[PDB]
Design a protein around this ligand. Structure first.
Ligand SMILES: [Zn+2]
Ligand SMILES: [Zn+2]
Lengths: 147, 144
């Protein structure tokens, strides 16, 4: 019936990214959307959980699998405040999601577009709320806005 | 405590995945000749697209060591790790991945392009071919 904008979901991901920031983790937030509903939320928790896979995007994808009772999450859209790493990019491929939408650019997702392990095609949208996403990462890494 | 010794344990784990009707891949994470992580493929039955054998072993390893970084560990996998699991090995900063048989479909190499990329912070060493035929026999029996 209705669809929220990209910016609406990115703003929720930005809220989640601050949860990681407050816990002294790389401040990335992610939200997985199917039929205009949240089926997954994530923020970075690798350090506190002792889990090298606990990135924001992975946590949202795992929550989606639990919501759908299906390791395949067809036609879902994953929002991430930061360009996903190679581990998370492969997880989306195996998840068979429809679209990834990320804020600021960064291995990373762009480096692995035509990698031989890409049986499925995921659509890419970038730049949504780029300024807000970059502000979190620059404040966490003490870098200028140029980076 | 040879490569073949650890691969044989991963082969035992790969049959657990077979018994669960999953793509039969097993993995064992070894640090200083001790097992710190064991995993087998469970992605379909667990509704988790990340629940591959290699990730399951690394996740248990992170909790056994109380550290998401698993320095100097060696990960044994009966099957060539996918891109997702290769990315997990990089972030875990393990020393070496040892796998049996390659993926005939997705391989160009593909794992080297991701694990041993020269412009990367960490390089994971690759050893392949350990009990490859035994690893392949499990996967072929599962496919048709
Ligand atoms: Zn990631
Ligand atoms: Zn994998």
């Amino acid at each position: 019936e209705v669809e929220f904008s990209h910016e609406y979901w990115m703003r929720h991901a930005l809220t989640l990214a601050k949860r990681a920031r407050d816990e002294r983790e790389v401040p990335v937030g992610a939200v997985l959307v199917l039929n205009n509903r949240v089926i997954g939320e994530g923020w970075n928790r690798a350090k506190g959980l002792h889990d090298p896979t606990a990135h924001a995007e992975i946590m949202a994808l795992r929550q989606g699998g639990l919501v759908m009772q299906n390791y395949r999450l067809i036609d879902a859209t994953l929002y991430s405040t930061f360009e996903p790493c190679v581990m998370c990019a492969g997880a989306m491929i195996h998840s068979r999601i429809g679209r990834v939408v990320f804020g600021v650019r960064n291995g990373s997702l762009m480096d692995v577009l035509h990698h031989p392990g890409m049986n499925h095609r995921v659509e890419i949208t970038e730049g949504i709320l780029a300024d807000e996403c970059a502000a979190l990462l620059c404040r966490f890494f003490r870098m200028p806005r140029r980076v």
